[PDB]
Amino acid sequence: GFDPEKAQCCLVENGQILTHGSGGKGYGLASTGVTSGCYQWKFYIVKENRGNEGTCVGVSRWPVHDFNHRTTSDMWLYRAYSGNLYHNGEQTLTLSSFTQGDFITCVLDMEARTISFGKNGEEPKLAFEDVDAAELYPCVMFYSSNPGEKVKICDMQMR
Structure with a gap:
């Protein structure tokens, strides 16, 4: 699930969901990091504004120093709105x-x-x-100003 200690301007909802909260742009990382081998999982988009999305998904280093999708080298991100x-x-x-x-x-x-x-x-x-990171965490980032988007983290056989 999502780690409330690795979330900024987001709330962790019943462990499995990251919800964009107050405070402007934000992010949240999963609890467990990956350090070797290969790991597969899914994100499921629970709540968004269709046609004007504000979410990116991907992986992140910890700690996070830059979470601006346009500049960050801490994260590797995939943007809902445009692909x-x-x-x-x-x-x-x-x-x-x-x-x-x-x-x-x-x-x-x-x-x-x-x-x-x-x-x-x-x-x-x-x-x-x-x-080129030693340890990476599944993550979600929101670049919208307003709260509300929700993303679920899922095992690879969820569908």
């Missing part, structure tokens, strides 16, 4: 957009140093290479 990818800036590769009711499969391969994302059970597509 854009962010790490040390917006990348060329664009994947599918996503919204409320969608699942995003995330594959964090610490051996190959890659991150891949699949939408609604489609095979994951390679998103990032040369991933």
Whole structure:
């Protein structure tokens, strides 16, 4: 689930859900980090503003010093509204957009140093290479100003 000690301007709802709260832009990381091998999981978009989304999903270092999706090198992010990818800036590769009711499969391969994302059970597509953190946590970030978005973290066989 989500760790309330690794959440900023977000609330952890019954462990499994991260809700965008007061205080402006924010983030939350999962409880457990990944340090070797490969780990697969899903995010499920519980609540969003369809066509004007404010969520990114991905993985993060801890501690977080920069959570601005446009600049951060602490996070590797995938943006709901446009399908854009962010790490040390917006990348060329664009994947599918996503919204409320969608699942995003995330594959964090610490051996190959890659991150891949699949939408609604489609095979994951390679998103990032040369991933260069020792330990990474599943994360969600919200760049909207107002509260309300909700994302659930799920096991890889949830559908």
